[PDB]
Amino acid sequence: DWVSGKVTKVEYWTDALFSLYVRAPVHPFTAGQFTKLGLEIDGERVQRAYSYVNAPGNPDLEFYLVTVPEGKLSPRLASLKPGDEVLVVSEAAGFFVLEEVPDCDTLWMLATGTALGPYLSILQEGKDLERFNNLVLVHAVRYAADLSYLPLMRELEQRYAGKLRIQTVVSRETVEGSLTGRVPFLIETGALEEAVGLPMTTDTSHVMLCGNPQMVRDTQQLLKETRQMTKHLRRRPGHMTAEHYW
Amino acid sequence: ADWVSGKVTKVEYWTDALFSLYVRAPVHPFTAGQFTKLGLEIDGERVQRAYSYVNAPGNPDLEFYLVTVPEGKLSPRLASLKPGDEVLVVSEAAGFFVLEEVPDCDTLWMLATGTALGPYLSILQEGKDLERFNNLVLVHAVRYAADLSYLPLMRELEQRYAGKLRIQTVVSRETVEGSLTGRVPFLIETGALEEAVGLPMTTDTSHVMLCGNPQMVRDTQQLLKETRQMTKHLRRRPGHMTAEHYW
Ligand SMILES: Cc1cc2nc3c(=O)[nH]c(=O)nc-3n(C[C@H](O)[C@H](O)[C@H](O)COP(=O)(O)OP(=O)(O)OC[C@H]3O[C@@H](n4cnc5c(N)ncnc54)[C@H](O)[C@@H]3O)c2cc1C
Ligand SMILES: Cc1cc2nc3c(=O)[nH]c(=O)nc-3n(C[C@H](O)[C@H](O)[C@H](O)COP(=O)(O)OP(=O)(O)OC[C@H]3O[C@@H](n4cnc5c(N)ncnc54)[C@H](O)[C@@H]3O)c2cc1C
Ligand SMILES: NC(=O)c1ccc[n+]([C@@H]2O[C@H](COP(=O)([O-])OP(=O)(O)OC[C@H]3O[C@@H](n4cnc5c(N)ncnc54)[C@H](OP(=O)(O)O)[C@@H]3O)[C@@H](O)[C@H]2O)c1
Ligand SMILES: NC(=O)c1ccc[n+]([C@@H]2O[C@H](COP(=O)([O-])OP(=O)(O)OC[C@H]3O[C@@H](n4cnc5c(N)ncnc54)[C@H](OP(=O)(O)O)[C@@H]3O)[C@@H](O)[C@H]2O)c1
Ligand SMILES: [Ca+2]
Ligand SMILES: [Ca+2]
Ligand SMILES: [Mg+2]
């Protein structure tokens, strides 16, 4: 069921990255889930999926978006202003949630670009992570200026008091404090595990992968070929849980 | 890889973003459907990317159909080459997206998005070793009708194959006469593509080649597996679909 949402704020982080804040009578959701946003464009209802950034129970629904220049809906969401109406599906969907994650010593959460949101909702909620000894959050972007949620990421790192390790990855420039390259290369060379201080192996880890579908594909391929890791299904458990954004 | 120096003979733009790059270079003979790598020494590296030959093997005008990727590293630099510029070229082609790897079938379907039409154009311009296929289907899927850069070549090929080759163009963001509207998996699932071409896409009749946009390749393979019971092809474990992803 669609419901009418009210835009409270659009905040731009760069010329292309922005966060959209909404009030809408949605149902409770599980951290990691997504809903759909909708607008009427040229007489047609256009809808896309967007992950909740906010923890469940935060009434300020938050979405981390990138403007796709030739896209249908994202440039229109990008022009929303406080007070504008946006349609929101009241029932969330998705299985990219903690309750579906197998037990493991280390939960790796890998995200590209604007796909960070499910992890932020999970980590801001802060519940049901006791059974994991280690948490690792990796945000991979083109440029350091694209690390829009680095302040929250550092606050979360502080609050988890050493359980959560954060690592930023910047692929198109070299910046102090970040690894340079793409995630598959960084896994294969040992760079990511050296920087984080933890191994990513079948004996220790479960790996969640969110965002760029070619990154998800290539990382799963590499983990399968070199780490003997398998894709996870609820009915057929494995080491790798993925959510593709397109 | 043995790099050789190539000479740009021409860059020809078809739209603001689509162009063909023409090169002379001492490359080895290649098999139609294969690709080489082009390189420029820029940005403190030898930036190199794979590009499919559009030309038939034996055509000395090496031809590459490219799209300018807005924030891309190499494609905007290739797009600003001029006659007489040097471009580096790997002399030995690579790739298995070639006829000798295609299982026997009644109908060979060749589906391409965007600038991934090149391997099929090289195969179909060469025109050899297609006797074992009864029917050939060439599908070019693009966003806008203006993006059908090789439509005149496709029409001449359609004429020269005297009916053996069926061509269909697909345009996803507008409705234009002569083209189907939408995305290839949707056109397959509704029967519209097959109705337009007049041939079925089934495991009994077809092998399907998929070239270009990796999501389209992924989604088309998924649809065909789920609804036509097709499998991915490996030389050692034959199946019904052969893919070449462009990223
Ligand atoms: C479960 C799910 C959750 C999603 N969550 C988010 C989210 O939190 N934030 C978000 O920005 N998008 C998210 N997406 C993607 C989103 O649904 C849209 O596809 C995106 O907003 C583009 O829509 P569009 O109509 O503008 O472009 P379309 O014309 O529908 O899409 C065309 C192209 O947009 C590009 N694209 C789409 N999404 C992204 C992206 N995230 N980053 C970079 N390029 C992209 C791809 O190149 C794609 O081929 C999610 C998708 C799914 C399925
Ligand atoms: C076997 C093979 C054959 C290829 N043949 C061709 C060809 O004939 N013509 C061609 O234009 N490209 C072709 N490609 C893609 C090509 O190698 C490059 O990736 C492309 O030119 C962009 O390079 P870049 O340095 O500009 O971009 P990068 O910054 O290195 O790439 C980033 C992004 O560019 C986009 N992109 C890459 N290729 C394409 C494409 N073809 N269409 C749309 N978006 C794209 C994707 O979004 C990709 O993530 C081929 C790739 C392979 C593996
Ligand atoms: N200029 C910018 O910084 C910027 C920022 C946001 C959005 N945009 C616009 O929006 C689009 C880009 O969105 P985005 O940058 O947020 O997302 P993106 O293109 O998915 O890039 C996110 C990250 O994923 C990496 N990646 C891509 N393919 C990969 C693969 N196969 N394996 C591993 N890693 C891979 C990229 O590395 P690579 O860098 O090597 O691709 C990058 O670090 C473009 O249309 C662009 O115009 C631009
Ligand atoms: N003016 C233009 O329209 C134009 C044309 C060429 C190049 N460009 C630029 O170059 C890039 C686009 O290049 P391109 O148009 O050559 O290639 P592309 O984005 O790969 O699109 C080629 C075709 O693939 C289809 N497709 C995409 N994802 C699919 C999927 N999951 N399943 C099935 N089909 C799918 C597209 O349909 P959809 O339309 O539904 O995505 C389109 O018909 C952008 O940066 C763009 O700005 C612009
Ligand atoms: Ca608040
Ligand atoms: Ca795209
Ligand atoms: Mg890309």
XYZ file of C-alpha atoms and ligand atoms in Angstrom:
698
model
C 0.000 0.000 0.000
C 1.324 3.398 -1.040
C 1.142 6.224 1.478
C 1.723 9.946 1.099
C 5.065 11.122 2.499
C 6.205 14.687 3.206
C 9.743 15.721 2.299
C 11.358 17.390 5.299
C 14.838 18.059 3.911
C 17.085 17.409 0.922
C 20.754 17.778 1.831
C 23.434 17.717 -0.868
C 26.824 16.268 0.017
C 28.372 16.758 -3.434
C 26.943 17.883 -6.743
C 25.558 14.361 -7.264
C 25.193 12.732 -3.815
C 22.330 13.786 -1.557
C 20.215 12.494 1.293
C 16.438 12.710 1.200
C 14.545 12.983 4.509
C 10.864 12.095 4.705
C 7.974 11.775 7.142
C 5.461 9.104 6.192
C 3.168 6.617 7.965
C 5.193 3.493 7.118
C 5.088 0.248 9.082
C 7.972 -0.824 11.327
C 10.804 -2.350 9.311
C 13.853 -4.474 10.003
C 17.213 -2.712 9.804
C 18.689 -3.452 6.388
C 15.376 -3.413 4.514
C 14.253 -1.108 1.726
C 11.023 0.470 0.618
C 9.952 2.082 -2.658
C 9.695 5.815 -3.367
C 7.311 7.087 -6.015
C 6.537 10.217 -8.007
C 4.067 11.068 -10.735
C 6.053 11.989 -13.856
C 4.239 13.058 -17.041
C 1.082 11.296 -15.877
C 2.869 8.041 -14.966
C 3.649 6.656 -11.527
C 7.409 5.941 -11.405
C 8.866 3.951 -8.506
C 12.272 2.670 -7.404
C 13.628 0.821 -4.380
C 15.630 2.735 -1.755
C 17.291 1.416 1.392
C 16.455 2.977 4.747
C 19.541 4.665 6.216
C 17.831 5.408 9.508
C 17.452 2.886 12.284
C 13.956 1.428 12.607
C 11.971 3.626 14.934
C 13.653 6.816 13.730
C 10.649 8.719 12.293
C 12.966 10.769 10.061
C 13.139 8.320 7.157
C 16.468 8.846 5.410
C 17.671 7.798 1.955
C 21.165 8.162 0.538
C 20.942 8.814 -3.195
C 23.050 9.627 -6.187
C 21.703 11.577 -9.147
C 21.834 9.407 -12.271
C 22.017 12.090 -14.993
C 19.898 10.293 -17.627
C 17.746 8.452 -15.071
C 13.988 8.650 -14.786
C 13.297 9.009 -11.058
C 16.538 9.952 -9.298
C 16.910 13.448 -10.898
C 13.317 14.169 -9.844
C 13.889 13.028 -6.263
C 16.993 15.222 -6.400
C 14.801 18.299 -7.064
C 12.385 17.686 -4.178
C 12.182 20.446 -1.575
C 10.810 20.618 1.995
C 7.051 20.227 1.872
C 6.870 18.255 -1.385
C 4.926 15.009 -1.521
C 6.670 11.724 -2.261
C 4.896 8.379 -2.302
C 6.265 5.673 0.024
C 5.348 1.993 0.227
C 4.276 1.375 3.822
C 5.581 -2.221 4.051
C 9.332 -2.657 3.771
C 10.923 -5.513 1.843
C 14.242 -7.303 1.742
C 16.364 -10.047 3.312
C 19.604 -8.026 3.766
C 19.059 -8.106 7.513
C 20.942 -9.450 10.514
C 18.509 -12.278 11.280
C 19.413 -13.908 7.917
C 23.191 -13.760 8.553
C 24.891 -17.006 9.672
C 26.999 -17.079 12.813
C 30.599 -16.034 12.222
C 33.543 -14.551 14.033
C 33.654 -11.507 11.725
C 30.768 -9.908 9.813
C 32.141 -7.969 6.840
C 29.858 -5.298 5.385
C 31.070 -4.097 1.988
C 29.243 -1.280 0.201
C 29.898 0.890 -2.837
C 28.688 4.453 -3.233
C 25.170 5.071 -1.986
C 24.699 1.441 -0.968
C 25.945 2.128 2.571
C 22.432 2.639 3.923
C 21.445 -0.892 5.014
C 24.586 -1.182 7.126
C 24.054 2.247 8.690
C 20.503 1.276 9.672
C 21.812 -1.965 11.204
C 24.715 -0.302 13.002
C 22.671 2.669 14.278
C 20.052 0.271 15.628
C 22.882 -1.448 17.490
C 20.915 -4.556 18.450
C 21.505 -8.281 17.933
C 25.218 -7.926 17.103
C 26.406 -9.687 20.276
C 26.903 -13.038 18.536
C 29.528 -11.495 16.219
C 32.962 -10.892 17.720
C 34.085 -8.445 15.030
C 32.274 -6.071 12.674
C 33.935 -4.488 9.641
C 32.386 -1.691 7.573
C 34.003 -0.904 4.215
C 32.770 2.019 2.091
C 34.168 2.103 -1.460
C 33.773 5.339 -3.487
C 35.450 7.025 -6.465
C 36.685 10.062 -4.513
C 37.314 10.994 -0.885
C 34.730 13.753 -1.269
C 32.123 10.996 -1.843
C 32.456 9.611 1.727
C 29.264 11.418 2.713
C 28.659 9.474 5.948
C 32.226 9.355 7.280
C 31.280 11.420 10.401
C 28.524 8.957 11.373
C 30.903 6.101 10.537
C 33.505 7.505 12.970
C 30.871 8.112 15.665
C 29.688 4.501 15.247
C 33.299 3.297 15.441
C 33.619 5.193 18.725
C 30.402 3.796 20.189
C 31.213 0.147 19.389
C 34.425 0.601 21.400
C 36.651 -1.547 19.175
C 34.145 -4.153 18.004
C 33.477 -2.207 14.786
C 36.366 -1.501 12.412
C 35.804 0.968 9.592
C 37.785 1.143 6.384
C 37.365 3.563 3.504
C 38.329 2.752 -0.084
C 38.857 5.435 -2.750
C 39.402 4.165 -6.279
C 40.264 7.248 -8.379
C 42.718 9.093 -6.112
C 45.147 8.453 -3.266
C 44.205 9.894 0.123
C 45.746 9.455 3.564
C 43.659 7.063 5.635
C 42.015 5.242 2.721
C 42.986 2.233 0.647
C 43.306 2.851 -3.089
C 41.702 0.551 -5.635
C 38.743 -1.735 -6.059
C 37.671 -4.212 -3.378
C 38.536 -7.429 -5.319
C 42.107 -6.254 -5.925
C 42.400 -5.184 -2.277
C 41.191 -8.573 -0.993
C 43.377 -10.579 -3.349
C 46.577 -8.700 -2.444
C 45.913 -8.847 1.307
C 45.707 -5.056 1.520
C 42.182 -4.890 2.942
C 42.803 -7.576 5.572
C 46.132 -6.012 6.547
C 44.506 -2.596 6.974
C 41.573 -3.952 8.998
C 43.619 -6.464 10.960
C 41.282 -9.408 10.331
C 41.177 -12.244 7.772
C 38.229 -12.838 5.484
C 38.030 -16.626 5.174
C 35.442 -19.381 5.400
C 36.609 -20.219 8.914
C 36.101 -16.700 10.281
C 33.776 -14.603 8.170
C 30.475 -13.895 6.534
C 30.581 -11.231 3.825
C 27.702 -8.971 2.931
C 27.994 -7.093 -0.367
C 25.724 -4.170 -1.280
C 25.568 -1.836 -4.263
C 27.333 -1.759 -7.607
C 26.302 -5.043 -9.294
C 29.633 -5.479 -11.083
C 31.478 -5.034 -7.767
C 29.151 -7.610 -6.178
C 29.676 -10.035 -9.062
C 33.457 -9.601 -9.197
C 33.927 -9.795 -5.429
C 31.874 -13.001 -5.219
C 33.798 -14.486 -8.137
C 37.134 -13.689 -6.494
C 36.046 -14.963 -3.076
C 34.776 -18.158 -4.693
C 37.934 -18.810 -6.738
C 40.533 -17.838 -4.124
C 38.779 -18.211 -0.738
C 36.441 -21.173 -1.550
C 33.440 -19.102 -0.491
C 29.884 -19.803 -1.655
C 26.840 -17.634 -2.279
C 24.380 -17.709 0.630
C 20.730 -18.738 0.450
C 18.488 -19.179 3.470
C 17.689 -22.737 2.315
C 21.333 -23.369 1.284
C 23.637 -21.423 3.582
C 26.868 -19.899 2.326
C 29.462 -17.238 3.133
C 28.323 -14.351 0.877
C 25.074 -12.354 1.119
C 24.462 -9.837 -1.669
C 22.069 -7.026 -2.609
C 22.489 -5.530 -6.105
C 21.334 -1.946 -6.634
C 20.792 -2.445 -10.375
C 51.143 -8.816 -24.701
C 53.154 -7.477 -27.671
C 52.291 -3.789 -28.010
C 52.676 -2.134 -31.406
C 52.290 1.474 -32.496
C 49.061 2.195 -34.342
C 48.232 5.234 -36.462
C 44.855 6.860 -36.135
C 43.400 7.324 -39.572
C 40.058 8.849 -38.534
C 37.640 9.422 -35.656
C 34.053 9.710 -36.908
C 31.259 10.788 -34.554
C 27.778 9.313 -35.004
C 26.231 11.239 -32.080
C 27.663 13.507 -29.399
C 28.828 10.416 -27.491
C 29.065 7.565 -30.054
C 32.005 7.347 -32.465
C 34.131 4.947 -34.469
C 37.907 4.932 -34.204
C 39.828 3.806 -37.290
C 43.422 2.611 -36.997
C 46.260 1.157 -39.048
C 48.529 -1.099 -37.021
C 50.733 -4.171 -37.626
C 48.463 -6.584 -35.743
C 48.350 -10.369 -36.287
C 45.431 -11.994 -38.129
C 42.471 -12.360 -35.769
C 39.265 -14.390 -35.674
C 36.034 -12.467 -36.245
C 34.477 -11.757 -32.844
C 37.769 -11.269 -31.025
C 39.007 -8.096 -29.366
C 42.302 -6.338 -28.864
C 43.449 -3.759 -26.336
C 44.071 -0.106 -27.104
C 46.414 1.947 -24.951
C 47.448 5.549 -24.368
C 50.285 6.652 -22.097
C 48.369 9.139 -19.969
C 47.628 9.867 -16.319
C 50.956 8.351 -15.242
C 50.066 4.910 -16.609
C 49.652 3.073 -19.882
C 45.874 3.147 -19.637
C 44.528 0.208 -21.637
C 41.087 -1.295 -22.308
C 39.720 -4.078 -24.484
C 37.876 -3.129 -27.681
C 36.155 -5.490 -30.125
C 37.133 -5.385 -33.802
C 34.188 -4.197 -35.922
C 36.022 -4.882 -39.188
C 36.193 -8.297 -40.789
C 39.612 -9.920 -40.423
C 41.636 -8.952 -43.470
C 40.253 -5.418 -43.543
C 43.392 -3.312 -42.830
C 41.265 -0.440 -41.492
C 40.891 -1.610 -37.909
C 37.622 -0.200 -36.662
C 36.329 0.237 -33.117
C 32.846 1.447 -32.148
C 33.015 3.351 -28.853
C 30.924 5.384 -26.455
C 32.412 8.281 -24.517
C 32.037 7.346 -20.858
C 31.535 10.706 -19.090
C 34.041 10.223 -16.250
C 35.913 7.427 -18.008
C 39.688 7.269 -18.010
C 40.440 6.091 -21.563
C 37.285 6.463 -23.668
C 37.181 10.320 -23.548
C 40.858 10.367 -24.563
C 40.358 7.965 -27.459
C 37.425 10.179 -28.442
C 39.750 13.164 -28.920
C 42.293 11.379 -31.134
C 42.910 12.892 -34.567
C 44.298 11.512 -37.852
C 47.998 10.872 -37.418
C 47.901 10.387 -33.639
C 49.532 7.306 -32.157
C 47.512 4.711 -30.291
C 49.053 1.553 -28.810
C 47.573 -1.772 -29.975
C 48.084 -5.339 -28.765
C 49.158 -7.303 -31.834
C 47.538 -10.630 -30.850
C 43.776 -10.625 -30.479
C 42.006 -12.510 -27.683
C 38.567 -13.837 -26.924
C 36.274 -16.806 -27.459
C 33.223 -14.861 -28.709
C 33.747 -16.474 -32.129
C 31.873 -18.835 -34.439
C 34.118 -21.882 -33.912
C 33.042 -21.949 -30.223
C 29.285 -21.822 -31.004
C 27.432 -25.178 -30.776
C 25.426 -26.362 -33.765
C 21.911 -24.895 -33.838
C 19.071 -24.045 -36.186
C 19.023 -20.370 -35.216
C 22.002 -18.361 -33.994
C 20.776 -15.306 -32.074
C 23.203 -12.423 -31.651
C 22.014 -9.870 -29.086
C 24.048 -6.718 -28.487
C 23.528 -3.535 -26.466
C 25.036 -0.182 -27.328
C 28.567 -0.367 -28.687
C 28.774 -4.151 -28.230
C 27.595 -4.745 -31.818
C 31.186 -5.005 -33.090
C 31.825 -8.757 -32.723
C 28.687 -9.564 -34.702
C 29.577 -7.054 -37.396
C 33.035 -8.599 -37.784
C 31.520 -12.101 -37.974
C 28.745 -11.113 -40.380
C 30.942 -8.956 -42.647
C 33.420 -11.821 -42.891
C 30.456 -13.990 -43.854
C 32.228 -17.353 -43.576
C 31.520 -20.572 -41.645
C 27.839 -19.671 -41.180
C 26.557 -22.479 -43.439
C 25.828 -24.806 -40.523
C 23.257 -22.347 -39.106
C 19.938 -22.194 -40.928
C 18.955 -18.811 -39.516
C 20.843 -15.812 -38.133
C 19.260 -13.060 -36.019
C 20.984 -9.771 -35.193
C 19.444 -7.626 -32.440
C 20.826 -4.198 -31.535
C 19.376 -2.665 -28.362
C 19.987 1.025 -27.580
C 18.398 3.886 -25.658
C 17.419 6.058 -28.630
C 16.910 5.548 -32.355
C 19.690 8.070 -33.024
C 22.062 5.550 -31.347
C 21.657 2.921 -34.117
C 24.973 3.953 -35.605
C 25.500 0.927 -37.857
C 21.935 0.677 -39.163
C 23.101 1.200 -42.803
C 25.620 -1.640 -42.518
C 22.951 -3.832 -40.938
C 20.608 -3.127 -43.855
C 23.277 -3.943 -46.462
C 24.102 -7.162 -44.575
C 20.400 -8.034 -44.446
C 20.249 -7.573 -48.206
C 23.397 -9.610 -48.892
C 22.342 -12.624 -46.793
C 19.196 -12.796 -48.954
C 16.906 -13.606 -46.012
C 19.180 -15.853 -43.942
C 19.886 -12.888 -41.657
C 17.026 -11.261 -39.748
C 17.753 -7.913 -38.124
C 15.754 -6.272 -35.368
C 16.517 -3.004 -33.619
C 15.356 -2.322 -30.063
C 15.005 1.182 -28.594
C 14.362 1.422 -24.848
C 13.609 5.116 -24.159
C 11.368 6.118 -27.076
C 8.927 4.545 -29.528
C 10.067 4.722 -33.174
C 8.742 2.958 -36.255
C 10.937 0.080 -37.358
C 12.150 -0.718 -33.830
C 10.822 -2.657 -30.875
C 10.406 -0.702 -27.654
C 11.806 -1.884 -24.366
C 14.476 -4.125 -22.924
C 15.473 -7.473 -24.369
C 14.375 -9.702 -21.426
C 10.920 -8.093 -21.481
C 10.686 -8.524 -25.261
C 11.691 -12.174 -24.911
C 9.267 -12.910 -22.095
C 6.253 -11.463 -23.907
C 7.049 -13.143 -27.233
C 7.340 -9.754 -28.973
C 10.932 -10.243 -30.153
C 10.234 -13.738 -31.500
C 6.993 -12.602 -33.124
C 8.812 -9.739 -34.861
C 11.652 -11.945 -36.114
C 9.443 -14.973 -36.868
C 11.652 -17.518 -35.063
C 11.488 -19.045 -31.576
C 14.190 -18.757 -28.873
C 14.152 -22.269 -27.452
C 16.585 -24.975 -26.414
C 15.437 -27.096 -29.346
C 16.285 -24.487 -31.994
C 18.689 -21.847 -30.746
C 21.996 -20.772 -29.391
C 22.025 -17.237 -27.946
C 25.039 -14.927 -27.957
C 24.905 -11.986 -25.501
C 27.237 -9.015 -25.804
C 27.585 -5.766 -23.919
C 25.821 -4.286 -20.910
C 26.572 -6.745 -18.082
C 23.184 -6.277 -16.410
C 21.387 -7.067 -19.655
C 23.567 -10.153 -20.119
C 22.903 -11.192 -16.523
C 19.151 -10.503 -16.638
C 18.682 -12.079 -20.065
C 20.555 -15.233 -18.985
C 18.469 -15.365 -15.812
C 15.187 -15.051 -17.723
C 16.202 -17.649 -20.288
C 17.250 -20.073 -17.550
C 14.048 -19.611 -15.548
C 11.544 -19.573 -18.423
C 13.248 -21.351 -21.356
C 15.414 -23.774 -19.295
C 18.632 -22.592 -20.950
C 22.096 -22.998 -19.441
C 25.318 -21.057 -19.716
C 27.780 -22.386 -22.268
C 31.315 -23.526 -21.529
C 33.471 -25.204 -24.169
C 33.905 -28.210 -21.873
C 30.268 -28.139 -20.647
C 28.156 -27.017 -23.599
C 25.027 -24.973 -23.127
C 22.716 -22.564 -24.919
C 24.068 -19.084 -24.131
C 27.461 -17.526 -24.752
C 28.178 -14.180 -23.106
C 30.747 -11.415 -23.408
C 30.392 -8.679 -20.771
C 31.779 -5.229 -21.584
C 32.280 -4.373 -17.900
C 16.754 -3.000 -3.159
C 17.312 -1.745 -3.784
C 17.763 -0.714 -2.965
C 18.275 0.466 -3.514
N 18.723 1.450 -2.662
C 19.210 2.560 -3.198
C 19.685 3.592 -2.307
O 19.646 3.532 -1.077
N 20.202 4.715 -2.959
C 20.297 4.884 -4.339
O 20.796 5.916 -4.801
N 19.836 3.904 -5.160
C 19.338 2.792 -4.608
N 18.919 1.784 -5.439
C 18.868 2.057 -6.875
C 17.539 2.758 -7.217
O 16.411 1.900 -7.016
C 17.541 3.346 -8.633
O 17.875 2.370 -9.611
C 18.371 4.620 -8.805
O 17.870 5.613 -7.910
C 18.335 5.139 -10.224
O 16.963 5.364 -10.615
P 16.622 6.155 -11.934
O 15.141 5.968 -12.264
O 17.122 7.516 -11.776
O 17.488 5.425 -13.037
P 17.122 4.186 -13.954
O 16.853 4.741 -15.331
O 15.989 3.448 -13.390
O 18.489 3.359 -13.760
C 19.524 3.393 -14.761
C 20.927 3.349 -14.194
O 21.053 4.062 -12.945
C 22.310 3.686 -12.379
N 22.168 3.539 -10.932
C 21.069 3.082 -10.255
N 21.213 3.064 -8.952
C 22.503 3.529 -8.756
C 23.275 3.726 -7.597
N 22.829 3.504 -6.356
N 24.527 4.202 -7.752
C 24.974 4.448 -8.986
N 24.341 4.298 -10.149
C 23.106 3.823 -9.968
C 22.765 2.406 -13.097
O 23.760 2.806 -14.027
C 21.486 1.988 -13.824
O 21.705 1.164 -14.962
C 18.348 0.601 -4.911
C 17.892 -0.427 -5.730
C 17.371 -1.595 -5.183
C 16.881 -2.682 -6.105
C 36.157 -7.863 -24.307
C 35.728 -6.419 -24.212
C 35.381 -5.729 -25.369
C 34.981 -4.384 -25.307
N 34.655 -3.750 -26.471
C 34.274 -2.514 -26.414
C 33.912 -1.865 -27.649
O 33.969 -2.381 -28.765
N 33.509 -0.557 -27.494
C 33.412 0.127 -26.294
O 33.026 1.298 -26.303
N 33.754 -0.497 -25.137
C 34.157 -1.751 -25.205
N 34.468 -2.399 -24.037
C 34.532 -1.603 -22.806
C 35.903 -0.901 -22.726
O 36.967 -1.837 -22.543
C 35.946 0.174 -21.632
O 35.513 -0.323 -20.370
C 35.253 1.488 -21.999
O 35.838 2.017 -23.191
C 35.291 2.515 -20.886
O 36.663 2.741 -20.485
P 37.070 4.043 -19.686
O 38.545 4.038 -19.279
O 36.579 5.185 -20.466
O 36.179 3.874 -18.390
P 36.398 3.348 -16.910
O 36.543 4.584 -16.031
O 37.564 2.453 -16.840
O 35.050 2.417 -16.789
C 33.963 2.790 -15.918
C 32.576 2.542 -16.474
O 32.475 2.746 -17.899
C 31.216 2.196 -18.305
N 31.376 1.513 -19.578
C 32.452 0.772 -19.982
N 32.334 0.274 -21.189
C 31.086 0.711 -21.606
C 30.357 0.506 -22.794
N 30.816 -0.198 -23.837
N 29.129 1.065 -22.879
C 28.672 1.776 -21.843
N 29.267 2.030 -20.674
C 30.478 1.467 -20.618
C 30.737 1.282 -17.172
O 29.768 2.014 -16.438
C 32.011 1.139 -16.342
O 31.788 0.776 -14.989
C 34.921 -3.738 -24.062
C 35.274 -4.428 -22.907
C 35.668 -5.764 -22.970
C 36.045 -6.480 -21.697
N 32.433 11.964 -9.725
C 32.088 11.286 -8.640
O 32.863 11.123 -7.689
C 30.710 10.714 -8.574
C 30.195 10.324 -7.349
C 28.919 9.813 -7.277
C 28.179 9.677 -8.429
N 28.686 10.062 -9.645
C 27.879 9.866 -10.860
O 27.032 8.751 -10.624
C 27.629 7.601 -11.246
C 28.665 6.996 -10.334
O 28.046 6.636 -9.089
P 28.993 6.227 -7.870
O 30.378 6.689 -8.147
O 28.338 6.636 -6.598
O 28.978 4.632 -7.965
P 29.826 3.539 -8.767
O 30.013 3.988 -10.171
O 29.188 2.220 -8.524
O 31.244 3.590 -8.032
C 31.359 3.115 -6.678
C 32.652 2.353 -6.515
O 32.505 1.024 -7.080
C 33.701 0.703 -7.738
N 33.476 -0.345 -8.720
C 32.832 -0.225 -9.922
N 32.816 -1.335 -10.614
C 33.514 -2.237 -9.828
C 33.841 -3.592 -10.011
N 33.502 -4.289 -11.089
N 34.553 -4.200 -9.033
C 34.886 -3.491 -7.951
N 34.631 -2.217 -7.669
C 33.935 -1.636 -8.660
C 34.168 2.013 -8.350
O 35.554 1.899 -8.649
P 35.984 2.652 -10.001
O 36.224 4.076 -9.612
O 37.228 1.963 -10.448
O 34.878 2.527 -11.006
C 33.897 2.957 -7.184
O 34.979 2.968 -6.267
C 28.170 8.179 -12.553
O 27.120 8.355 -13.489
C 28.735 9.526 -12.088
O 28.540 10.528 -13.072
C 29.958 10.573 -9.735
N 21.878 10.308 -25.333
C 21.820 9.030 -24.987
O 20.769 8.460 -24.703
C 23.109 8.249 -24.955
C 23.412 7.263 -25.892
C 24.640 6.632 -25.845
C 25.494 6.894 -24.795
N 25.151 7.759 -23.810
C 25.968 7.862 -22.566
O 26.731 6.659 -22.416
C 26.194 5.884 -21.321
C 25.123 4.973 -21.863
O 25.687 4.205 -22.941
P 24.787 3.295 -23.904
O 23.456 3.932 -24.149
O 25.613 2.966 -25.105
O 24.573 1.936 -23.066
P 23.723 1.201 -21.912
O 23.480 2.111 -20.749
O 24.450 -0.081 -21.677
O 22.305 0.898 -22.593
C 22.183 0.066 -23.776
C 20.846 -0.630 -23.716
O 20.895 -1.613 -22.649
C 19.643 -1.627 -22.017
N 19.774 -2.208 -20.688
C 20.376 -1.618 -19.606
N 20.321 -2.348 -18.521
C 19.607 -3.475 -18.902
C 19.200 -4.619 -18.188
N 19.451 -4.807 -16.894
N 18.485 -5.552 -18.861
C 18.228 -5.348 -20.162
N 18.565 -4.317 -20.933
C 19.256 -3.397 -20.236
C 19.262 -0.157 -21.967
O 17.876 -0.052 -21.634
P 17.441 1.214 -20.688
O 17.220 2.385 -21.631
O 16.152 0.730 -20.044
O 18.528 1.471 -19.678
C 19.632 0.259 -23.389
O 18.585 -0.048 -24.294
C 25.704 6.952 -20.340
O 26.818 7.534 -19.675
C 25.069 7.936 -21.329
O 24.914 9.264 -20.849
C 24.030 8.535 -23.951
Ca 14.786 13.784 14.203
Ca 23.637 2.106 -16.335
Mg 29.829 2.483 -14.287
